[PDB]
Write a protein that binds this DNA or RNA. Sequence first.
DNA 1: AAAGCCGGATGTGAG
DNA 2: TCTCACATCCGGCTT
Length: 93
Amino acid sequence: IADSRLLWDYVYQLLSDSRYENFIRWEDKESKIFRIVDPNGLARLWGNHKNRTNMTYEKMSRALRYYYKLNIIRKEPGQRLLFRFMKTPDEIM
DNA sequence: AAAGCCGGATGTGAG
DNA sequence: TCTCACATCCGGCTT
């Protein structure tokens, strides 16, 4: 968690700690489908994790959208705040 | 309406 | 350096 520096890694570690389920949680752990339960809250954690000021979900969602073309994380269509990891942490590296 | 999601255009700071 | 990995902003589309 603390050693993490990329957004996909930080999101993955929060999804591994049950103390953060009210921010972000698995909906299908095997398929690596997760839901962002608190968009504004998760953005606050991401900004604090990067020692940054004024991090918002609008800006953080843009970073997730860059993962679309890179085949790292894809958004489940038609659903709200439902995303899917396309690669394991090893496949991304 | 108004908020959620999209990708373009550019900035930025670390490596 | 350029590249990388977002960060910042925004108009257009969608819900």
